[PDB]
Ligand binder design. Structure first.
Ligand SMILES: Fc1ccc(-c2ncn(Cc3ccncc3)c2-c2ccnc3[nH]ccc23)cc1
Length: 289
């Protein structure tokens, strides 16, 4: 099937749905997202607006083409490689400290870039970071802007108001404590969620993971309470203190504070050097012969 002028649509990749495609003109694989012109939640075109505003950033997927063909709204992106969730599963849910610290450095920088563009992500989780392919295989990219929201006025840098009593939109496992309290998400929240993702990679799971409950709202209750009853020093026991210092600093941030991204990268960098590691982008999965 013929999309745009120059894109050939292949079978599904996974996840509307995601498809393998070919830029017939340039001889390069691409990824395509189709959305029916009928949906009770039209998303792609709004999501595509945000991807367009991120273009040019390190580790932002390049938009090849946006448009409509037949029944569908269409976005085409350069092809990327497997997610951190997919690589974590492929590695038996065990990452070395070096890998976690290599990831952490880049992941902080992606989040910082998104914030520089007046947005917060609000779905920071392993699925929403992808490694590149080929010459870009040492590069962590970030995806999925379907839950993203402006946190400040583009022009007047006016932060959004402190709001309360909200529903949890996102992934409960990585949500901030303040998110569980029903407080408006801001820059601090994206970083705290990263903090939990990093401890996830260290541990293989999180302690509030796989709690049984009769219903959904009950499960979220249990996750919230488990998080709020697990001290940071307990979550992080047996791992370098930096992971605790990182989360404590995130939990200390005020609603409208600009995070010291630099401080957080330096934290992991100092530990990196103390362990005698080198920023040669050799991740655990690069050593599978
Ligand atoms: F225009 C778009 C918008 C979003 C996607 C996408 N959504 C999720 N993924 C990751 C995924 C998909 C299916 N199974 C596992 C992981 C992609 C995606 C996949 C591969 N390479 C890509 N490069 C840019 C996005 C993307 C794809 C095209």
């Amino acid at each position: 099937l013929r999309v745009g002028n120059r894109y050939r649509l292949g079978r599904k990749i996974g996840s509307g749905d995601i498809y393998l495609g070919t830029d017939i003109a340039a001889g390069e694989e691409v990824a395509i997202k189709l959305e029916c012109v009928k949906t009770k939640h039209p998303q792609l075109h709004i999501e595509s607006k945000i991807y367009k505003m991120m273009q040019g950033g390190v580790g932002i997927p390049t938009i090849r083409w946006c448009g409509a063909e037949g029944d569908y709204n269409v976005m085409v992106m350069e092809l990327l490689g497997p997610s951190l969730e997919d690589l974590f599963n492929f590695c038996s849910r065990k990452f070395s400290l070096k890998t976690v610290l290599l990831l952490a450095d880049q992941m902080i920088s992606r989040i910082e870039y998104i914030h520089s563009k007046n947005f917060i992500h609000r779905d920071v989780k392993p699925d929403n970071f992808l490694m590149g392919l080929g010459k870009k295989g040492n590069l962590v990219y970030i995806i999925d802007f379907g839950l993203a929201k402006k946190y400040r006025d583009a022009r007047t840098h006016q932060h959004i108001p402190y709001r309360e009593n909200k529903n949890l939109t996102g992934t409960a496992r990585y949500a901030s404590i303040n998110t569980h309290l029903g407080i408006e998400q801001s820059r601090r929240d994206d970083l705290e969620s990263l903090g939990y993702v990093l401890m996830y990679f260290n541990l293989g799971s999180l302690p509030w993971q796989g709690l049984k409950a009769a219903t959904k709202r009950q499960k979220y209750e249990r996750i919230s309470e488990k998080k709020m009853s697990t001290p940071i020093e307990v979550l992080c026991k047996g791992y370098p203190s930096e992971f605790a210092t990182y989360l404590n600093f995130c939990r200390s941030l005020r609603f409208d504070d600009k995070p010291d991204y630099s401080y957080l990268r330096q934290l992991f960098r100092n530990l990196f050097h103390r362990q005698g590691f080198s920023y040669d982008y050799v991740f655990d999965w690069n050593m599978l012969k």
